[PDB]
Amino acid sequence: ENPKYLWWNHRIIPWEEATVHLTDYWWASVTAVFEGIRGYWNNAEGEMYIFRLEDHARRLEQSMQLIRMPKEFTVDEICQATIDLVRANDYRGDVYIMPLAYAVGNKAFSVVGDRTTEMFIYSRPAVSRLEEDFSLHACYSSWTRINERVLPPRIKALANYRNSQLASSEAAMNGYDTALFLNPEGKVAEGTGSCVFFVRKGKLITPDITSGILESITRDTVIHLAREVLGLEVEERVVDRTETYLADEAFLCGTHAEITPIASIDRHEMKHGAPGPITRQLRDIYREVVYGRDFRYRNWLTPVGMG
Amino acid sequence: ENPKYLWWNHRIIPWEEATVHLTDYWWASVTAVFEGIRGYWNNAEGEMYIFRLEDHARRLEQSMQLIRMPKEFTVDEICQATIDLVRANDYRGDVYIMPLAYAVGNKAFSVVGDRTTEMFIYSRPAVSRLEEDFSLHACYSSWTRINERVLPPRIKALANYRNSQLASSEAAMNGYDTALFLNPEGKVAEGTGSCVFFVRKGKLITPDITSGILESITRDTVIHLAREVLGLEVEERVVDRTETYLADEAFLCGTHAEITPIASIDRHEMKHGAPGPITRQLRDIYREVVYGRDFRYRNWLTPVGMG
Amino acid sequence: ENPKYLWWNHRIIPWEEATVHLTDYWWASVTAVFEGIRGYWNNAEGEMYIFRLEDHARRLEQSMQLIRMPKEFTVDEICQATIDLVRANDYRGDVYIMPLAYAVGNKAFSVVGDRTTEMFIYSRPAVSRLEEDFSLHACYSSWTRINERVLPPRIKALANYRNSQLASSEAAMNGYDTALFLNPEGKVAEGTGSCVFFVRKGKLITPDITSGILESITRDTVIHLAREVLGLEVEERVVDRTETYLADEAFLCGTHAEITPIASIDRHEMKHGAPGPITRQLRDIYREVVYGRDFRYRNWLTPVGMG
Amino acid sequence: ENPKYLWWNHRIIPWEEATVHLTDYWWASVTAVFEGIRGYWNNAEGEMYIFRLEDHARRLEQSMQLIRMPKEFTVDEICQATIDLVRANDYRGDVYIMPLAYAVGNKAFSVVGDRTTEMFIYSRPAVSRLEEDFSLHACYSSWTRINERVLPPRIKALANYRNSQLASSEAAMNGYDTALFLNPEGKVAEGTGSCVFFVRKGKLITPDITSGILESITRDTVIHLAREVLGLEVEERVVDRTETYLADEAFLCGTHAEITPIASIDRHEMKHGAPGPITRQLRDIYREVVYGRDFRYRNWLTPVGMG
Amino acid sequence: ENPKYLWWNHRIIPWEEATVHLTDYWWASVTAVFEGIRGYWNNAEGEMYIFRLEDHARRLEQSMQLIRMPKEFTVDEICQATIDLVRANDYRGDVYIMPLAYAVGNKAFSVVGDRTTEMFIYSRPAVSRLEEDFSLHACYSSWTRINERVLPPRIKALANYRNSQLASSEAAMNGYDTALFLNPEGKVAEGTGSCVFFVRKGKLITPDITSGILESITRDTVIHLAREVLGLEVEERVVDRTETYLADEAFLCGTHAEITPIASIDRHEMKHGAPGPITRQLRDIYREVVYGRDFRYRNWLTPVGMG
Amino acid sequence: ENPKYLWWNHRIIPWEEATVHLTDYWWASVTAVFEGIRGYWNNAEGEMYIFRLEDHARRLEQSMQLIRMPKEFTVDEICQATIDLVRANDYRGDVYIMPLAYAVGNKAFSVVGDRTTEMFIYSRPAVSRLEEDFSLHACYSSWTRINERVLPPRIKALANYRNSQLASSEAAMNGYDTALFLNPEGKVAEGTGSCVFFVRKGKLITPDITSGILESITRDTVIHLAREVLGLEVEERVVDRTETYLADEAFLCGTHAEITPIASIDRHEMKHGAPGPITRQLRDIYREVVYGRDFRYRNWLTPVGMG
Ligand SMILES: Cc1ncc(COP(=O)(O)O)c(CN)c1O
Ligand SMILES: Cc1ncc(COP(=O)(O)O)c(CN)c1O
Ligand SMILES: Cc1ncc(COP(=O)(O)O)c(CN)c1O
Ligand SMILES: Cc1ncc(COP(=O)(O)O)c(CN)c1O
Ligand SMILES: Cc1ncc(COP(=O)(O)O)c(CN)c1O
Ligand SMILES: Cc1ncc(COP(=O)(O)O)c(CN)c1O
Ligand SMILES: [Cl-]
Ligand SMILES: [Cl-]
Ligand SMILES: [Cl-]
Ligand SMILES: [Cl-]
Ligand SMILES: [Cl-]
Ligand SMILES: [Cl-]
Ligand SMILES: [Cl-]
Ligand SMILES: [Cl-]
Ligand SMILES: [Cl-]
Ligand SMILES: [Cl-]
Ligand SMILES: [Cl-]
Ligand SMILES: [Cl-]
Ligand SMILES: [Cl-]
Ligand SMILES: [Cl-]
Ligand SMILES: [Cl-]
Ligand SMILES: [Cl-]
Ligand SMILES: [Cl-]
Ligand SMILES: [Cl-]
Ligand SMILES: [Cl-]
Ligand SMILES: [Cl-]
Ligand SMILES: [Cl-]
Ligand SMILES: [Cl-]
Ligand SMILES: [Cl-]
Ligand SMILES: [Cl-]
Ligand SMILES: [Cl-]
Ligand SMILES: [Cl-]
Ligand SMILES: [Cl-]
Ligand SMILES: [Cl-]
Ligand SMILES: [Cl-]
Ligand SMILES: [Cl-]
C-alpha cells in the first residue's frame, strides 16, 4: 500500500505517524515548490543510484529562495535525508522521490516571509520505461505557457502546474497523448512535465532556457551525452512551431518522463520514426548511465548500498 | 481553538474526524477552486445573514466546471451545507466561510476529468472592520497579473494566488500595505485579493471584467448600491495607471476585505482622504445591508436563525 | 452542372465563354477581395429576394479601395449586375452569389495601383438550413486571428482565408465541426467564416468590431432584430474565452452560415441547448425576413421577379 | 508571347492546352504554395544551370506538407519535371521557373486534407542584373510582418504576399524602391520578396530564421560564400531597426532579386556605397557560381545540356 | 522681436532680465512639463479671451504631480500669472501662451523629489487659421506611440515629443503634412501635437483616452459642441487604422492646431472633403466660442480687458 | 564655482560668455543627444587620460545622425575640442566631460532636418570611486524600458532619461539605491544610467544589445578585459529576471558609474558579496587601464599633457 517511512521537518517517521488535518495545507500549497528525483536499482551491485541528487537539491533550495521561504533546510540535509529515506524504506527497485517544501501560516491565499518553512520527502516505487520502445502523439496547446512576467517557469512551483493542466486536459480531450506549449511570443517552450528536443539534419535543437522553461536536469544531461558520447551539434536557441513539424525525430525529457519519443506533432509525423536512430542511441546511453553501467558519468550518481 | 464541525463530501463531521495523511492533497491542490463567503451576526434578531450565498455557490460551480471537475455537488447542496454548518457550529458572531473543491487522483501535478470531485466547507470566526475608519497605502506591482492566455482570472483557482503572492510579498518588502496589478497590456486589473474602485469628479470608475479580474460579488454589490442608493455614475472600463494616481478616493472591495479605503497609490495621496466622502457613504450602506438593517436588499441575504 | 451565365468585366456571358489560361490569375489572387450574397426564393411570390445587396456591394467597394484597386466598377453597377445575373440564370431557388474583384499585372506576388481592376460575379444554387434544427461543436484554435498590424480583417481578402484554414483544418483533425479564433491579445474574435454571438442571462453578447473581425452584415441584421423584434439587450464588447464556456446559448452568423447554433465550445455544453430558446426565435425571425414574409424589414430585400 | 510548354499534374503539355474556367482556382489559391527557381544560361557550355533545384523542390514539399496537401508529387519528380520543361521549351537564355502547388475542392475559402493536390511548373525568360551596378532606396514599412502566431513565414504560401503588398504599395506611394519589414516585437525581419543583409565593421549581419522570415536559399548561399570564399564573420541574430541605419552596406537577396544592393534605409545612406566593396565581391562570386564558372560550388548546379 | 515681459518663479520680469547660462537647464528639461494656452483677441470688446485657462492650469498641476515635482505653484497662481502677463505685454492680438515647469538640481539626467520646482510662462503672438479653409494630408507613422508602460501620454512632458519627432520627421521626408500614431496594440492613438476625430455616417468617432493619448481640452470642447449644439452622436472608443481610411471627414484638434481638417490618410481621400460639412460647422462654432461671440459657452473664457 | 572655459559651436569661450535667454533651448532639448566621457588624472605622469574618446565621439555622431541633425561637426573636431577644453581648464584631477548636441528652430516641440545643428562640451571635476569598496541595493522597476518601437535606446537622447527617472524615482521612494529595467517582453535590459553584468558559476552574463539597451563603451571594455586578462567566458544573451536573483555577483557599468557592485536585487543577496571576487579583479584591472598604468590597453587612452 504505502512506503514504510517518509521524511518530514528534519526526521524520518513511520508513514502512519504523518497524520494531519484536512484543513492544514491548502493555503500552504500556493507557496509550495518541489523536485522529482529518480533512484535506479542495480540488482547486480545491490545499489540504488540516485541521479543528480545534489543538482536537484540545489534547484529546490533555489526555488525556495525565489518563493521567499525563510532558510530552514540546507542542500546537504536534503541530499542526506533522500539517501536515509531510500535506505530505510528497504525497497530494492526503481523509485521516484518527491521533496516538497512549503511555507505555513497566514490557514489564510493572497506574506511568505512571515511564514515558517517546512518540507517532506516521499519516495515510492516507480517503473522505468527505458527498456521499452514506445512513442507519444503530441499537440501544441491553445493555452500559452506561463512566463517571467506573471509566474516564472524557472521556479518549480506547484501552482505552475495549473497551467500544465489546461494543456494536458486539452490534449486528452482532443485525442493526443501529450501537449507542448508555445510562450506568449509564440515560440516553442516546453511540455506540461518535461523539456522537448528536436532532431533535424543530424543535429539536436532545444528551446533555450529564456524561452520560458524549467532548467531541466534531464535536458542538461542529454546535451552533455549528445556532445560528449555521440559528437553531435546541439543548438539551444529560439525554436519556431512550424520547424518542429519537419523534425526527423523529437522527444520529451524529464526525470519522471525519462526519454520519451514523440511520433508526431499536430499530426505531422517525425520522418525517422519514434524512437528514431539518434533518440534510440541517447535513450540507451542515458539508461546505462543512470543504472551505474557507465563509469564516464559516475560523478552524476549517488549510490545507496542496500546490502 | 477550532470550530466544532466542518462539512466534507456531503456530510457534516466533527472537526477532529477530518484527519488525513500529510501526502494526500498536494497534487489535488493544483486543481482546487474556492469561495470566500461572509456571515454577519445580528444580535438583535438572533440571526446570521450569509451574504449572496447563491451567487457564491454558482461561481464555485462555474469555477469547478472550468477546471473540468466531474459533476458531484449542486448549487442547492453547497447553499444548504453552508447554512447547516453555520448553525451546527453554534458560533453567534461574524464568520468567514471557505468552500474548497478539488479533484483527487493522478498522488500524481502536470488529467482532471479522470479524477473524482471532492469538497469541504470550513467556517471560522472573522471580525468585520466596517465600524472602523482605517486606510491602506498601495503600490502597483512590478509583477504582471495572470490573463486569459495562461491562467484565466475568472476561475477562482488556488494556483492563481501564487501570482497574488509575488505582488503581496513585493508590497510588504517595499513598505506598502497592499499591491495592485497591471495586466499584460499595462492596464489596471485588480488587487491581490480584492477588486479596486476609484472616485474622480464625483463618479465611480472600476476596471471592466475583461481587464483580467475576478468577477467580484462585492464589486457587483457596490455598483448596484452606488447607482441605486447614491444615484452615482459608475464606469466599468479600461483604466490607466496614471489616472488612478489622480483619484479623489480609492478603495478595495472583496468578501474578506469588505470595503477597504486606499490612502495612496505609489505615494500619490487620494485628494479627498481615506475613507473619502463617497467611500464613507458606500461603506455605511454596505454595512447596513449585510447586517440585515436595509429591507431594500433583503433578497441578497440568507438568514440562519440560531434562536 | 454549371449555371447558364456569369458576369465578368461589365457584361453577362455564357458560362462556357469564360475560358482562361491556367497561369492567368495566381498572382491576381493575392490582391483579390470578394463578397458572399444570398438570394432566397419565394415560390408563392415568384420572386428572388437578394438580402442586403447594396450593403454587400458597398463593402466590396470598400475592400477594393483598401487593396488599392483602381476605380473601375461602381456600387450601382455591382447591384445591377447581381440582379441581371440571377434573372438570366433562370434558377428559381435559393442561391449563393460571389462577386470577386482582382487586380491583374505585375503574371508576377510581392504594386497594386499600377494594375487593372477586374471583377466577376458567380451565382450558384445553394440550400438554406433555416427550416432545420442542427448544431455544431466548436473549439478555440491554437492559431491566432489576423489583426490590423499584419492583415486587416475588415478587408474581405481571399488571402485572409489562409489563416481561416489553419483553424478549420485543426478543428477537423481534432474532432470538432468548426473553429473560433482568439485575437493576439487573447480575446474572442470570430469564426473561420462567420461572426459569433453568445447568450447569457437573457442578453446577447458579441465581440466588438475592433476585436479584429469582419464587419458582418448578418451580425448587424441580428443586432437589429434582437433589439427591435425581441426587445433584448445586446452588448458589442471585448469578450473573454472562459466566459463563452458558460454561455446559455451560442451561434455563428454569416451569409453562407445563416444562423448556425453552437452546441458546445471546447467540450463545454451550452446550458440551454442548440438551438436554444433565443437562438430559435432569432433564426425563425431571420428566416421570415429573408424570404420576404416580414414587411417591417422590406428595405433589406432586393426583389427579382422571375415571372 | 508565351513559352512552348508547361508542366501540369505529371505531364508536359503545349501551352495552349492548359485552358481552364475563370471560376476554377480562386478558392484553390488560398491553399497555394510556390517556389522561385532560376536557370542561368552558359552559352560557352551550351548548358542551362538550374540553381539549387533539389533544395527548392524540398522546400516546396515542406510547404505543401505544412498546408496539409495530400501527398501526390515527390522531390525527384519536381526536379525531373523542371529539367524536362527547361529543355522542351528550347529557350537558350536565363529563365525564372515557378512551380506552384494547390489543393482543389471545397469551388468553395474558409478543409485542405479532403481536397486533391495539383501542381504546375511555368518557366519563362527572365534577365539577370548581376553584370549591372544598381541600387535601391528602402523604407521600413508601417505594416508588420506575418508571424508564426497567424501565418507562418516559413511556409511559401501565396496568401503571405497580401502582407508583402501592404508594404510594397506603401513604399511605392512614399517614394521608395522597396520595403523592409519589422516583426511584431519590432525587430528586423525580411523584405517583401527577399531576405536582407547588413555589413558593418567588415562583418555580415542578417536576421535569424526565427525573426519570422522565409528560410531563403539565396541567404544560405551568401552565408556559405561569405565564410568560405571571403573569410568573413557572419552573424545570424536578432537585428534592430536603428543599427541597420548605420550599416556600411546593405543588400537584398533572393532567387528573383539575386543580390540587390541597398543605397539607403529610411533616407539613411549606407556609408560605403551600393554596391559597397563586400557586396560587390559577393555579387561577383555569386555570379561566377550560378553561371557554372566556379568548380568549388558545382554541387549546387543542375546542368541541362541543350546541345 | 520679443515680448516685453515673461513670468518666472512668482514674478513678472522684463524679457531681457531672464538671462541664464548655456549649461543651466539641459538636465532640468528631462523633468519638464508644459501647457499650450491660446488667447483670442476680440477688437470689438477690447478683450482677450484666454480659453479654458483653469482646465489648462489644473492639467499642468497634474503633470507636475505625476513628474513628482515638489509643490511650489498653485492652480490659482498659474491662472493669475497668465492673465497678468497677457495684460502687461500689451499685445492686442491672438497669442499662444506656454507655461513650462521644471525641477532643477541633480546640473546632473538619469531623483526628481530632491530637486526644487520652478516655472516660467511665455506669451507670444500667434495667428489663428479659423477663418481659413485649408487641409492636411496625413500618414500613419512606422513609429509607435508611447504608452503607460514606458512614458505615460497623459503627462504633458517635453520628453514625450522625442517620440512625436520620430513621426513628424518621417511624415515630412515621405511627402505628408502631418503624422498619426498607432499604439503598441496597433490601434489609433493621436497626432504628434493634437487629437484626431473621424466622421462617418453622420457620427463623430475619436480614440478613447485609454488608447494612449493626451486628455486634450480641445477634444473635450469638440465633444461638448458636437453633442450640445449640433445634436451629433459621438463615440469615444477603440478605433482601427483601416476604418479611418473610410472616414467621410477627419480633423486634428488641439490648442495650437485649433481644428485642422485632414484631406487624406495614407493617400485615402476623405469622401466629403476637408473641411467637410460637419467639420466646417464645428470649426465655425468653435471660432464663435473662443472669440467671445457665443454666450452659451462664456464659462470657458477668461476675459482680460486691455481697455 | 565653475570651470574656466567651455566649448560651444566650434570655439572655446570663457564660462561667463555663454549667457543665453531662459526661453532659448526648451524645444531644442527634445532633439538633444549627449555623451559622458571621463578624464583620469595621473599625477606621476602629469597627464590626463581621456578614456575611449574617439569611440564616444563616433557614438555622438551616430546619435546625431539618428536624430536627423544636419551635419555640422566631425568626429575629429569633437575629439580635438575635448582635448583643447581639458587642457585650457587647467584642472589637474579627474573630470567628467559632457558633449551635448541639439538642433534649434521650430522656439517651437512636436521637423529636425529644417533646424541648425549646435553643440557644446562641458568638462567639470568628478571624483572616481575605483579605490573604494562600496555596493548598491537594486530593484527591478514597475516601469518598462523604452524600446525600438517607440524611443530607440541605442540613441543617447536626453528624452530617454524621462523613462530612467520613472525608475530611479521609484527606487528611491521604495528604499533602494538604484533601479534595473525589464524590456516590454519582460527580459532584463539595463540600469537607469549604466549596463548590468551578472556573475554565476564563474562566467559573466550581460543582456545582448538587442535587449533594448545603450551600446555601453564601459560594457565593451569589461567584455574585452574579462576575456583577455582574466580568461573568463562572457555570454551576451537574453537574460531573465529570476536568474539574476541567483547571481553570485552583479555590477553596473558605465562611464560615470565606473564599475559599481550590486549587493542585492529585489532583496536577493548576491552569494559572493559586493564587490565579489571577479568584480574586484575587474574593477582593479579597469582602474589600472584608465589611469595609464596598463600598457596592454594604451590604444584606449588619449593623453593630454598638462606639463
Ligand atoms: C514543466 C517541466 N519542465 C521540465 C521538466 C523536466 O525537468 P527535470 O529534467 O529536471 O526533471 C519537468 C519535470 N520536473 C517539468 O515539470
Ligand atoms: C483576486 C481577487 N479578486 C477579487 C476578489 C473579490 O471577490 P468577491 O467580492 O467576490 O469576494 C477576491 C476575493 N475573492 C480575489 O481573491
Ligand atoms: C471571416 C468571416 N467573418 C464573418 C463573416 C460573416 O459576414 P457576413 O454576415 O457579412 O456574411 C464571414 C462570411 N462573409 C467571414 O468569412
Ligand atoms: C518573402 C520572401 N523572403 C525571402 C525570399 C528569398 O528566398 P530565396 O532566396 O529562397 O528565393 C523570397 C523570395 N522567394 C521571398 O518571397
Ligand atoms: C500629443 C498631443 N496630443 C494632443 C494635444 C491636444 O491637446 P489640447 O487640446 O489640450 O491642446 C496636444 C497639444 N497640447 C499634444 O501635444
Ligand atoms: C541608459 C544608459 N545605459 C548605459 C550607460 C553606460 O554607457 P557607457 O559605458 O558608454 O557610459 C549609460 C551611461 N552613458 C546610460 O545612460
Ligand atoms: Cl515502498
Ligand atoms: Cl555541454
Ligand atoms: Cl554543439
Ligand atoms: Cl519529474
Ligand atoms: Cl501523424
Ligand atoms: Cl467556531
Ligand atoms: Cl447596476
Ligand atoms: Cl451609471
Ligand atoms: Cl474573500
Ligand atoms: Cl503619499
Ligand atoms: Cl443554375
Ligand atoms: Cl441596432
Ligand atoms: Cl441593447
Ligand atoms: Cl458568406
Ligand atoms: Cl460537450
Ligand atoms: Cl520561352
Ligand atoms: Cl556556413
Ligand atoms: Cl562566422
Ligand atoms: Cl524568388
Ligand atoms: Cl539618403
Ligand atoms: Cl508681444
Ligand atoms: Cl459631453
Ligand atoms: Cl453621443
Ligand atoms: Cl498646443
Ligand atoms: Cl489622396
Ligand atoms: Cl574646473
Ligand atoms: Cl571581446
Ligand atoms: Cl567568451
Ligand atoms: Cl555616463
Ligand atoms: Cl538582501
PDB file of N, CA, C and O in Angstrom, chain C residues 88-113:
ATOM      1  N   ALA C  88     -31.113  36.147 -65.372  1.00  0.00           N
ATOM      2  CA  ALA C  88     -30.708  35.483 -66.636  1.00  0.00           C
ATOM      3  C   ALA C  88     -30.421  34.022 -66.371  1.00  0.00           C
ATOM      4  O   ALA C  88     -30.704  33.204 -67.286  1.00  0.00           O
ATOM      5  N   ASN C  89     -29.934  33.649 -65.176  1.00  0.00           N
ATOM      6  CA  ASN C  89     -29.677  32.208 -64.918  1.00  0.00           C
ATOM      7  C   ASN C  89     -30.988  31.407 -64.814  1.00  0.00           C
ATOM      8  O   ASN C  89     -30.937  30.200 -65.017  1.00  0.00           O
ATOM      9  N   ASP C  90     -32.098  32.053 -64.518  1.00  0.00           N
ATOM     10  CA  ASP C  90     -33.439  31.464 -64.539  1.00  0.00           C
ATOM     11  C   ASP C  90     -33.468  30.258 -63.624  1.00  0.00           C
ATOM     12  O   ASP C  90     -34.247  29.356 -63.863  1.00  0.00           O
ATOM     13  N   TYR C  91     -32.749  30.325 -62.505  1.00  0.00           N
ATOM     14  CA  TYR C  91     -32.843  29.286 -61.470  1.00  0.00           C
ATOM     15  C   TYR C  91     -33.767  29.797 -60.375  1.00  0.00           C
ATOM     16  O   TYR C  91     -33.388  30.766 -59.700  1.00  0.00           O
ATOM     17  N   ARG C  92     -34.918  29.129 -60.186  1.00  0.00           N
ATOM     18  CA  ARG C  92     -35.948  29.532 -59.226  1.00  0.00           C
ATOM     19  C   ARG C  92     -35.723  28.728 -57.951  1.00  0.00           C
ATOM     20  O   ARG C  92     -36.524  27.872 -57.605  1.00  0.00           O
ATOM     21  N   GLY C  93     -34.760  29.166 -57.174  1.00  0.00           N
ATOM     22  CA  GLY C  93     -34.417  28.507 -55.914  1.00  0.00           C
ATOM     23  C   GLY C  93     -33.331  29.258 -55.213  1.00  0.00           C
ATOM     24  O   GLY C  93     -32.796  30.233 -55.748  1.00  0.00           O
ATOM     25  N   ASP C  94     -33.061  28.847 -54.003  1.00  0.00           N
ATOM     26  CA  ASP C  94     -32.099  29.608 -53.196  1.00  0.00           C
ATOM     27  C   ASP C  94     -30.724  29.604 -53.863  1.00  0.00           C
ATOM     28  O   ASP C  94     -30.275  28.520 -54.293  1.00  0.00           O
ATOM     29  N   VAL C  95     -30.008  30.746 -53.838  1.00  0.00           N
ATOM     30  CA  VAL C  95     -28.678  30.888 -54.494  1.00  0.00           C
ATOM     31  C   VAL C  95     -27.707  31.522 -53.505  1.00  0.00           C
ATOM     32  O   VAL C  95     -28.130  32.258 -52.548  1.00  0.00           O
ATOM     33  N   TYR C  96     -26.451  31.284 -53.805  1.00  0.00           N
ATOM     34  CA  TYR C  96     -25.304  31.964 -53.181  1.00  0.00           C
ATOM     35  C   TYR C  96     -24.490  32.609 -54.278  1.00  0.00           C
ATOM     36  O   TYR C  96     -24.162  31.933 -55.266  1.00  0.00           O
ATOM     37  N   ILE C  97     -24.241  33.907 -54.107  1.00  0.00           N
ATOM     38  CA  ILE C  97     -23.672  34.773 -55.157  1.00  0.00           C
ATOM     39  C   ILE C  97     -22.315  35.275 -54.637  1.00  0.00           C
ATOM     40  O   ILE C  97     -22.261  35.836 -53.535  1.00  0.00           O
ATOM     41  N   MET C  98     -21.294  35.102 -55.433  1.00  0.00           N
ATOM     42  CA  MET C  98     -19.935  35.548 -55.104  1.00  0.00           C
ATOM     43  C   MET C  98     -19.424  36.535 -56.164  1.00  0.00           C
ATOM     44  O   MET C  98     -18.932  36.114 -57.211  1.00  0.00           O
ATOM     45  N   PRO C  99     -19.518  37.863 -55.904  1.00  0.00           N
ATOM     46  CA  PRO C  99     -18.695  38.829 -56.634  1.00  0.00           C
ATOM     47  C   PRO C  99     -17.266  38.692 -56.146  1.00  0.00           C
ATOM     48  O   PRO C  99     -17.036  38.584 -54.928  1.00  0.00           O
ATOM     49  N   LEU C 100     -16.320  38.711 -57.046  1.00  0.00           N
ATOM     50  CA  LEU C 100     -14.889  38.626 -56.732  1.00  0.00           C
ATOM     51  C   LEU C 100     -14.137  39.621 -57.613  1.00  0.00           C
ATOM     52  O   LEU C 100     -14.260  39.565 -58.833  1.00  0.00           O
ATOM     53  N   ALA C 101     -13.419  40.536 -56.986  1.00  0.00           N
ATOM     54  CA  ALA C 101     -12.650  41.594 -57.700  1.00  0.00           C
ATOM     55  C   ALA C 101     -11.164  41.302 -57.537  1.00  0.00           C
ATOM     56  O   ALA C 101     -10.747  40.785 -56.451  1.00  0.00           O
ATOM     57  N   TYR C 102     -10.355  41.613 -58.539  1.00  0.00           N
ATOM     58  CA  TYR C 102      -8.921  41.319 -58.529  1.00  0.00           C
ATOM     59  C   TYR C 102      -8.240  42.375 -59.393  1.00  0.00           C
ATOM     60  O   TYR C 102      -8.862  42.918 -60.296  1.00  0.00           O
ATOM     61  N   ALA C 103      -6.972  42.565 -59.120  1.00  0.00           N
ATOM     62  CA  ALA C 103      -6.129  43.453 -59.912  1.00  0.00           C
ATOM     63  C   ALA C 103      -5.141  42.628 -60.704  1.00  0.00           C
ATOM     64  O   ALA C 103      -4.477  41.792 -60.178  1.00  0.00           O
ATOM     65  N   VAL C 104      -5.027  42.744 -62.020  1.00  0.00           N
ATOM     66  CA  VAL C 104      -4.106  41.834 -62.793  1.00  0.00           C
ATOM     67  C   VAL C 104      -2.891  42.611 -63.275  1.00  0.00           C
ATOM     68  O   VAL C 104      -3.085  43.752 -63.626  1.00  0.00           O
ATOM     69  N   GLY C 105      -1.729  41.966 -63.371  1.00  0.00           N
ATOM     70  CA  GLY C 105      -0.491  42.547 -63.947  1.00  0.00           C
ATOM     71  C   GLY C 105       0.121  41.636 -65.004  1.00  0.00           C
ATOM     72  O   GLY C 105      -0.629  41.386 -65.925  1.00  0.00           O
ATOM     73  N   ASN C 106       1.444  43.237 -62.367  1.00  0.00           N
ATOM     74  CA  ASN C 106       2.760  42.568 -62.226  1.00  0.00           C
ATOM     75  C   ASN C 106       2.622  41.050 -62.118  1.00  0.00           C
ATOM     76  O   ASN C 106       2.087  40.541 -61.106  1.00  0.00           O
ATOM     77  N   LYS C 107       1.598  38.630 -64.827  1.00  0.00           N
ATOM     78  CA  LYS C 107       1.813  37.317 -64.167  1.00  0.00           C
ATOM     79  C   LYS C 107       3.059  37.385 -63.279  1.00  0.00           C
ATOM     80  O   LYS C 107       3.971  36.568 -63.479  1.00  0.00           O
ATOM     81  N   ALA C 108       3.087  38.340 -62.347  1.00  0.00           N
ATOM     82  CA  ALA C 108       4.227  38.481 -61.397  1.00  0.00           C
ATOM     83  C   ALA C 108       3.735  39.171 -60.107  1.00  0.00           C
ATOM     84  O   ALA C 108       2.826  40.073 -60.254  1.00  0.00           O
ATOM     85  N   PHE C 109       4.134  38.350 -57.186  1.00  0.00           N
ATOM     86  CA  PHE C 109       3.264  38.235 -55.987  1.00  0.00           C
ATOM     87  C   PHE C 109       3.559  39.346 -54.979  1.00  0.00           C
ATOM     88  O   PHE C 109       2.616  39.914 -54.435  1.00  0.00           O
ATOM     89  N   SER C 110       4.835  39.677 -54.804  1.00  0.00           N
ATOM     90  CA  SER C 110       5.246  40.570 -53.666  1.00  0.00           C
ATOM     91  C   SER C 110       5.015  42.086 -53.951  1.00  0.00           C
ATOM     92  O   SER C 110       4.780  42.807 -53.014  1.00  0.00           O
ATOM     93  N   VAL C 111       3.213  46.428 -57.810  1.00  0.00           N
ATOM     94  CA  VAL C 111       2.372  47.247 -56.882  1.00  0.00           C
ATOM     95  C   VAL C 111       0.951  47.356 -57.443  1.00  0.00           C
ATOM     96  O   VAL C 111       0.774  47.594 -58.652  1.00  0.00           O
ATOM     97  N   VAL C 112      -0.018  47.188 -56.552  1.00  0.00           N
ATOM     98  CA  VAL C 112      -1.466  47.057 -56.900  1.00  0.00           C
ATOM     99  C   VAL C 112      -1.906  48.246 -57.747  1.00  0.00           C
ATOM    100  O   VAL C 112      -2.646  48.074 -58.627  1.00  0.00           O
ATOM    101  N   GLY C 113      -1.533  49.455 -57.387  1.00  0.00           N
ATOM    102  CA  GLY C 113      -2.127  50.633 -58.071  1.00  0.00           C
ATOM    103  C   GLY C 113      -1.705  50.792 -59.547  1.00  0.00           C
ATOM    104  O   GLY C 113      -2.222  51.618 -60.246  1.00  0.00           O
TER     105      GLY C 113
END
